[PDB]
């Protein structure tokens, strides 16, 4: 299996699933290193973020837990095809990159917070993370290139 990925047993059905402890992705299907990646993301900030302010809200007061529920609800909508990533990033991301449908452009190792960077380099082009926590808040990361 590629970096980060482990096979596991689903507790509900008895079916195998796969999860990645670097990107927090999980999926039923069996899955599948670059110098640079291009990613977009959707940031949800909370009262404990480094800077609890954004273009959406002068004071961010939701808890970390409320931020995690928001993130989980956006992943559900993206995975079901109810909304696409770019639409939710534009409308709801607490990063100013929202204005570019979450696009951060291309970057190499040694530029972004570690947990964001590790998750980005562990995705393959096209794949999306689960909830990735950094000091900024909670992220959904889409690797575009
Ligand atoms: O650092 C920025 C701006 C980054 C950016 C890059 C390219 C285009 C637009 C913004 N904003 C932060 C929120 C934040 N924290 C991050 C950590 C990793 C990646 C993206 C992040 N975004 C904040 O406002 O606290």
């Amino acid at each position: 299996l590629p970096p980060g990925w482990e096979k596991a047993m689903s507790r509900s059905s008895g079916r195998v699933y796969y999860f990645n402890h670097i990107t927090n992705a999980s999926q039923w299907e069996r899955p599948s290193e670059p110098a640079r990646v291009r990613c977009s993301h959707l940031l949800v900030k909370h009262s404990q973020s480094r800077r609890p302010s954004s273009w959406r809200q002068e004071k961010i007061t939701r808890t970390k837990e409320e931020a995690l529920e928001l993130i989980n609800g956006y992943i559900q909508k993206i995975k079901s095809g109810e909304e696409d990533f770019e639409s939710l990033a534009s409308q709801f991301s607490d990063c100013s990159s929202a204005k570019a449908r979450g696009d951060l452009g291309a970057f190499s190792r040694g530029q972004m917070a570690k947990p964001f960077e590790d998750a980005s380099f562990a995705l393959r082009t096209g794949e999306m993370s689960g909830p990735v926590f950094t000091d900024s808040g909670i992220h959904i990361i889409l690797r575009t290139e």
Side-chain angles (χ1 to χ4, degrees), residues 12 24 32 41 49 76 91-93 108 120 130:
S12 208
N24 287 143
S32 102
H41 78 139
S49 296
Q76 288 194 301
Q91 302 172 248
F92 301 120
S93 179
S108 68
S120 296

Side-chain angles (χ1 to χ4, degrees), residues 99-112:
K99 299 325 150 147
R101 306 174 164 208
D103 182 38
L104 294 170
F107 55 90
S108 68
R109 272 192 195 272
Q111 305 176 218
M112 294 298 164

Side-chain angles (χ1 to χ4, degrees), residues 41 43 45 51 95-97 103-104 112-113 116 134 136 139:
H41 78 139
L43 176 60
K45 284 191 185 195
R51 194 181 75 80
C95 180
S96 57
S97 67
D103 182 38
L104 294 170
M112 294 298 164
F116 190 96
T134 70
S136 295
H139 303 252

Side-chain angles (χ1 to χ4, degrees), residues 66-113 115-140:
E66 283 157 346
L68 175 67
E69 161 162 345
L70 282 165
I71 287 275
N72 290 337
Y74 296 147
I75 295 178
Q76 288 194 301
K77 281 196 184 63
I78 289 161
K79 287 196 160 195
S80 74
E82 195 180 318
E83 293 294 332
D84 67 24
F85 180 85
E86 288 85 351
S87 299
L88 299 181
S90 289
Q91 302 172 248
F92 301 120
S93 179
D94 278 311
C95 180
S96 57
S97 67
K99 299 325 150 147
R101 306 174 164 208
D103 182 38
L104 294 170
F107 55 90
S108 68
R109 272 192 195 272
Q111 305 176 218
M112 294 298 164
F116 190 96
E117 162 193 312
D118 281 348
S120 296
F121 283 82
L123 295 163
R124 273 79 49 88
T125 288
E127 291 181 321
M128 185 178 76
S129 76
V132 173
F133 292 75
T134 70
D135 285 357
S136 295
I138 310 173
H139 303 252
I140 293 154

Side-chain angles (χ1 to χ4, degrees), residues 34-51:
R36 289 166 87 60
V37 296
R38 188 173 178 185
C39 292
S40 302
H41 78 139
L42 188 164
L43 176 60
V44 179
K45 284 191 185 195
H46 49 73
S47 61
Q48 275 198 82
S49 296
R50 192 206 269 346
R51 194 181 75 80

